[PDB]
């Protein structure tokens, strides 16, 4: 849809991968603020609002927080504390008509600037002249809508740019959109650092004989500590004390070493 009436769509209740979206050669213009490109997957958001439209090459710079312009003031206003960012790419191939007027229009006249994230459907005549226009279209009563005229021969500043703005909202509720956080391979029979569905720990993962219930995820034994996980048992690898048996420096120098409560098949060796 045109910039004067931008189409807004909601993304929620799904996992979003921004890494593929950000590492794309198609998207020429990618400036993001209030968000981290490095941690976008880590960040979670309740709602995503995507506003899509088409503008000129010069007007892309106008669409930015704290930036004012003809398009920004009367068509699309961005809040100062805006969270999210904008994506722009060239689409001169789509507007391949040699020459003529297009249905794309922008509100070049308006009584006053827009409030942030405000849409103006009405296209009534702008009474520019102080004389009462009396609802007559003509001089001093110019039509607010103005066409674009996207010609293929036009310069780089006049080429059509397909601009989509994503705004991320965290309401008074848990987020519904999170990053892929793709899982890595599973390693057992050796004590490793594990993070299963937010349950963090370190230890050996071992094949399990205990049978859980279909809805059950974690597993706790007496004293409320994790002993199994979904099914693998978590057993922390051999830790203990080490003591040094010496006959006394007065009589000798060599010593023996006892690793207490350690099956030393792992680490003149006696069990």
């Amino acid at each position, epitope marked *: 849809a045109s910039v004067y009436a931008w189409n807004r769509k909601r993304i929620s209740n799904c996992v979003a991968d921004y890494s593929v979206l950000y590492n794309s050669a198609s998207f020429s213009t990618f400036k993001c603020y209030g968000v981290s490109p490095t941690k976008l997957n880590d960040l979670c958001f309740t709602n995503v609002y995507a506003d899509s439209f088409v503008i000129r090459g010069d007007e892309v710079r106008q669409i930015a927080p704290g930036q004012t312009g003809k398009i920004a003031d009367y068509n699309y206003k961005l809040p100062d504390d805006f969270t999210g960012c904008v994506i722009a790419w060239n689409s001169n191939n789509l507007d391949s008509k040699v020459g*003529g*007027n297009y249905n794309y*229009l922008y509100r*070049l006249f308006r009584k006053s600037n827009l409030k942030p994230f405000e849409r103006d459907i009405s296209t009534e005549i702008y009474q520019a002249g102080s004389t009462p226009c009396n609802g007559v279209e003509g*001089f001093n009563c110019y*039509f607010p*809508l103005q066409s674009y*005229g996207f*010609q293929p*021969t036009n310069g780089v500043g006049y080429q059509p740019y397909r601009v989509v703005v994503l705004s991320f909202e965290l309401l008074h509720a848990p987020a519904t959109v999170c990053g892929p956080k793709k899982s890595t391979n599973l390693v057992k029979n050796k004590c490793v650092n594990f993070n299963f569905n937010g349950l963090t720990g370190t230890g050996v993962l071992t094949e399990s004989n205990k049978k859980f219930l279909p809805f059950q995820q974690f597993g706790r034994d007496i004293a409320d500590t994790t002993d199994a996980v979904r099914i693998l048992d978590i057993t922390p690898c051999s830790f203990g004390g080490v003591s040094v048996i010496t006959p006394g420096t007065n009589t000798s120098n060599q010593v023996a070493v006892l690793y207490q409560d350690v099956n030393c098949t792992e680490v003149n060796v006696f069990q």
Partner: nanobody
Amino acid sequence: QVQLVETGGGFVQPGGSLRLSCAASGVTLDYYAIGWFRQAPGKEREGVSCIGSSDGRTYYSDSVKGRFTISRDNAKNTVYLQMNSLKPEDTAVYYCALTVGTYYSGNYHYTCSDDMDYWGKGTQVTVSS
């Protein structure tokens, strides 16, 4: 490379008759509204006339009095404006300017704002005692 030019500014005592020619070159638009905007020294940018190329509908100010006739020369891509009974205050340098048409709701609108795309070197008209 769409070019516009104005010619024919004339000097004479009050009440004369003059012809202004608006010649364009390399126009890439099938439909275009053409306007005349005056500017002498001390005199700002205010519209006098603007015309739609699809049919020839004409918008004009409270100072036309009928002596401003603008013909759409289709063959020579020109606006032929002729004014008789010269007005000593309408003295000014004149720019003839081209804007794209508007296709909204299946109908054509021709809007000519204070800024109208590209302008052209003006022609000064002086008429005084």
